[PDB]
Ligand binder design. Structure first.
Ligand SMILES: O=C(O)C1=C[C@H](O)[C@@H](OS(=O)(=O)O)[C@H](O[C@H]2[C@H](O)[C@@H](NS(=O)(=O)O)[C@@H](O[C@H]3[C@H](O)[C@@H](OS(=O)(=O)O)[C@H](O[C@H]4[C@H](O)[C@@H](NS(=O)(=O)O)[C@@H](O)O[C@@H]4COS(=O)(=O)O)O[C@H]3C(=O)O)O[C@@H]2COS(=O)(=O)O)O1
Ligand SMILES: [Ca+2]
Ligand SMILES: [Ca+2]
Ligand SMILES: [Ca+2]
Ligand SMILES: [Ca+2]
Ligand SMILES: [Ca+2]
Length: 308
């Protein structure tokens, strides 16, 4: 059914139409997989001898341009470019750096590290170091390696219990905090293993893992731990909460809204939508529809995949 040559032709016609036909551009690109969009990009240059990304940057503008250009990048290229943006200058946008690093899998991070190095001619780890400090740096650097332990054939309940007590001994139980212990356990163990550790943790601590973080640490280190634990406990819900935060109240934090819709549209959007509706009462579709307008809105609603 998919025809890259046909799509590229229709996009070119839309770009050259007087005033630019954004609707057609959105209708096509937001209804094609990332892989198909790559095929469309090669077909476009093959036909016009011009790069699609460049053509669209000139033809589009505002939030819509941001969405479209983001969709044209491969998953790794997009994440790599988003990370670079968060660390730009004094990289004061720690929240974006945290979101990406705390949610990507070993496989995703392996490709991100590779592409980041190819695109910016520098190791992702070095830029992270420059935009982080203290234990916050140690945690982010560790996570970015994407070297989380694999899932064993058999569940190690003895270790699960061990880690749970260690987490407790390292924080709430003692004066101060043994941050390195928290970092080692939360970055080295597999996600599934940690989901069980956090459950078992409730048997030793009167505060769950999240509340324990709020009482033990502060600042970016605290926020990084909060994002990590949330994502480990329930990734779809984590993104649903970040999305809600990006639209609640006056205005919109477009940087977050666009990045999540673009990066998770083909990953777990169905689960994100379900968690969103369950917690916020309204559908994600409804929130997007109410916080944005025009072609930009249309594009995001297509990435949403539907109403709930
Ligand atoms: O939640 C609010 O912050 C908010 C809600 C209320 O609706 C209203 O509050 S009230 O007390 O006045 O009653 C007020 O509305 C805001 C709106 O929230 C702002 N959006 S934000 O910038 O994202 O924070 C903003 O909206 C204007 C923006 O330029 C833009 O909004 S959005 O689509 O990004 O959400 C939109 O402008 C274009 C839009 O970019 C185009 N998109 S396309 O992809 O190119 O097709 C397209 O949709 O057209 C619109 C409108 O174009 S026009 O304005 O040139 O005709 O909408 C803008 C707008 O509606 O003004 O500002 C409004 C109004 O706030 S103000 O203080 O009265 O100026 O706040
Ligand atoms: Ca137009
Ligand atoms: Ca432009
Ligand atoms: Ca303590
Ligand atoms: Ca809003
Ligand atoms: Ca808005």
């Amino acid at each position: 059914n998919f025809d890259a040559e046909r799509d590229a032709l229709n996009i070119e016609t839309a770009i050259k139409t007087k005033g630019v036909d954004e609707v057609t551009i959105v209708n096509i690109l937001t209804n094609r997989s990332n892989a198909q969009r790559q095929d469309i990009a090669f077909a476009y240059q093959r036909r016009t001898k011009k790069e699609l990304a460049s053509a669209l940057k000139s033809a589009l503008s505002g939030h819509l341009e941001t969405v479209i250009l983001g969709l044209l990048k491969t998953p790794a290229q997009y994440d790599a470019s988003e990370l670079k943006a968060s660390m730009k200058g004094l990289g004061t946008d720690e929240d974006s750096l945290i979101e990406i690093i705390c949610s990507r899998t070993n496989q995703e991070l392996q490709e991100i590290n590779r592409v980041y190095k190819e695109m910016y001619k520098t190791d992702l780890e070095k830029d992270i170091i420059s935009d982080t400090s203290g234990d916050f740096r140690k945690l982010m650097v560790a996570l970015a390696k994407g070297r989380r332990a694999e899932d064993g054939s058999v569940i190690d309940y003895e270790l699960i219990d061990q880690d749970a007590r260690d987490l407790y001994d390292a924080g709430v139980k003692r004066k101060g905090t043994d941050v390195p212990k928290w970092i080692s356990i939360m970055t080295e163990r597999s996600v599934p293993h940690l989901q069980k550790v956090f459950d078992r943790y409730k048997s030793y601590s009167p505060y769950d893992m999240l509340e324990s973080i709020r009482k033990e640490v502060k600042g970016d280190l605290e926020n990084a731990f909060l994002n990590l634990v949330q994502c480990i406990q329930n990734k779809p819900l984590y993104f649903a909460d970040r999305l809600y935060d990006s639209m609640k109240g006056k205005g919109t934090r477009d940087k977050v809204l666009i990045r999540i819709m673009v990066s998770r549209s083909e990953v777990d959007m169905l689960k994100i939508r379900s968690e969103f509706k369950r917690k916020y009462g309204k559908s994600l579709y409804y929130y997007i529809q109410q916080d944005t307008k025009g072609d930009y809105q249309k594009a995001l609603l297509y990435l949403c995949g539907g109403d709930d």
